[PDB]
């Protein structure tokens, strides 16, 4: 619901070219705040958000140790899954792991999730109850059994219900101005003649946070099926996001066309028109 | 913080 702490882990095997590549990133809501990358002499976990620049070495030392422990086990697991599926030792393969916790409006735990993927496809999922697993196949069933025997669910639930929630609180406090004080879209319409008798109206939403947004074109305030191209929401590179929506319109009929923007950072949905 | 608890597949 209200807020989340998620991590995304990628390990890629390179047999013959040393140990697997391992990258780990952490997000609060839509804001990345830490990263660990083992392509380096001594890879450390490092900050990726200015509100994380004021943590002491106790943070970085632990997170670095914890990151390296993760890389290690992901190496081991990459080996195991290669066996399970009897693949050649020459092949490069990808094990991914996402997990997160969400707060409800009361600031308390609402839900938790966790999911492994091998070569870009679900492998093993922690169920909603956080007490058991779903395996996609015979190999993943071997993994289910081993995690049952090891009480892995119980350990994951402690992380997700408790530790994860408690640090999310800390992070939301340290990045309050960015995470709670949202950034609404700066919003404008541009105009691009296609021919003699038609033009593209392009509705821009720029500089918005979080990433979730809706841009709609309407015709005399009603839903039309003209040509309406919508680009995928993209990062601005500074922590905010961008999107545009476009319609082709009969030249001279531009002002029958309104763009509607919805975003969590706006007091109210906004409406926008070409300004010649 | 990272998860301390690492499944063995």
């Amino acid at each position, epitope marked *: 619901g209200s807020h989340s702490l998620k991590y995304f882990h990628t390990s890629v095997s390179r047999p013959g070219r040393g140990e697997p590549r391992f990258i780990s990133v952490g997000y609060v809501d839509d804001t990345q705040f830490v990263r660990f990358d083992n392509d380096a002499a001594s890879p450390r976990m490092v900050p990726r958000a200015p509100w994380m620049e004021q943590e002491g070495s106790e943070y970085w030392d*632990r997170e670095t140790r*914890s990151a390296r422990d993760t890389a290690q086990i992901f190496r*081991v697991n990459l080996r195991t899954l290669r066996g399970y599926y009897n693949q050649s030792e020459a092949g490069s393969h990808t094990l991914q792991w996402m997990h997160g916790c969400e707060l409800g409006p009361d600031g308390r735990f609402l839900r938790g999730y966790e999911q492994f993927a091998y070569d870009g496809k679900d492998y093993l999922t922690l169920n909603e109850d956080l007490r058991s697993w779903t395996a996609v196949d015979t190999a993943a069933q071997i993994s289910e059994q081993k995690s049952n025997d090891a009480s892995e669910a119980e*350990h994951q639930r402690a992380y997700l219900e408790d530790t994860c929630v408690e640090w999310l609180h800390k992070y939301l406090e340290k990045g309050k101005e960015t995470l709670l004080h949202l950034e609404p879209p700066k919003t404008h319409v541009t105009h691009h003649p296609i021919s003699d008798h038609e033009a593209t109206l392009r509705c821009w939403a720029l500089g918005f946070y979080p990433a979730e947004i809706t841009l709609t074109w309407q015709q005399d305030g009603e839903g039309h099926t003209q040509d309406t191209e919508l680009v995928e929401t993209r990062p601005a590179g500074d922590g905010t996001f961008q999107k545009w929506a476009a319609v082709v319109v009969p030249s001279g009929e531009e002002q029958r066309y309104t763009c509607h923007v919805q975003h969590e950072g706006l007091p109210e949905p906004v409406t926008l028109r070409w300004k010649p | 913080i990272l998860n301390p*608890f690492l499944p*063995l597949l």
Partner: T-cell receptor, first 111, second 111 residues
Framework: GVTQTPKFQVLKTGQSMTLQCAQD?????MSWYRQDPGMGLRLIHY???????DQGEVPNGYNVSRSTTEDFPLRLLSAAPSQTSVYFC???????????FGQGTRLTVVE | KEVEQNSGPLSVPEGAIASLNCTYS??????FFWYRQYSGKSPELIMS????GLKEDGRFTAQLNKASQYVSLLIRDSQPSDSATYLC????????????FGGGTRLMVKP
């Protein structure tokens, strides 16, 4: 699943020896603890995987190495009375989950 | 010490309830264990606990409270075979040093 040897052992001040520890489970983490009579276990050294080692709370007097996943020998460099103790080896799936101990080694260092 | 248990020893009448307590200094601890040791033998795991609240297994109940930084063990219907050293161990995720053990509480079930 954790074989530790020897069960008992006497040493003269200044001798060296090696305590063996083998695990069948192929876990990444192995450890050495010691316990003096009527006291807690105190961590000597440990290893997070093949070819890595770190110091515990009471490293002094001892070395360790981890060529293979399976074995984690402990090495008394130069025996002293203060090392008279019971030594337990362990294996662990994760750094911070259950430790599975060996049968132990009682070691008396005599002058 | 980081992990505090009273060494005791403690008596409990046979058939009565035994209670054991353990405190730890570091809020960053995330795993908790009760081991049992019969004299000069290796610790055998009784119960592991990771979520706040209660966990039950036969005659054994463990309570964890991370806000107050204690774990406890409760033994129903105490038997002679429950005479032992009860060892509390925590996984301190801030320091990373495998499992940290308290000095142990020695319990005597008296018939």
């Amino acid at each position: 699943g954790v074989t530790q040897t020897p069960k008992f052992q006497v040493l003269k001040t200044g001798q060296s020896m090696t305590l063996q520890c083998a695990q069948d489970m192929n876990y990444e983490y192995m450890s050495w603890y010691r316990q003096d009579p009527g006291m807690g276990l105190r961590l000597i050294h440990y290893s997070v995987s093949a070819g890595l080692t770190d110091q515990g709370e009471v490293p002094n007097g001892y070395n360790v190495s981890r060529s293979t996943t399976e074995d984690f020998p402990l090495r008394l460099l130069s025996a002293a009375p203060s090392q008279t103790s019971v030594y337990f080896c362990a294996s662990h799936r994760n750094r911070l989950t259950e430790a599975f101990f060996g049968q132990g080694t009682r070691l008396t260092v005599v002058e | 010490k980081e992990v505090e248990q009273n060494s005791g020893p403690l008596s409990v009448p046979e058939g009565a309830i035994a209670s054991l307590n353990c405190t730890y200094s570091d809020r960053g601890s995330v795993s908790f264990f009760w081991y049992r040791q019969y004299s000069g033998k290796s610790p055998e795991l009784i119960m592991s606990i990771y979520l706040n609240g209660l966990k039950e297994d036969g005659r054994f109940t463990a309570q964890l409270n991370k806000a107050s930084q204690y774990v406890s063990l409760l033994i129903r219907d105490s038997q002679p075979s429950d005479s032992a050293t009860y060892l509390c161990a925590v996984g301190n995720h801030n320091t990373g040093n495998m499992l940290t053990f308290g000095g142990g509480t020695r319990l005597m079930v008296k018939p």
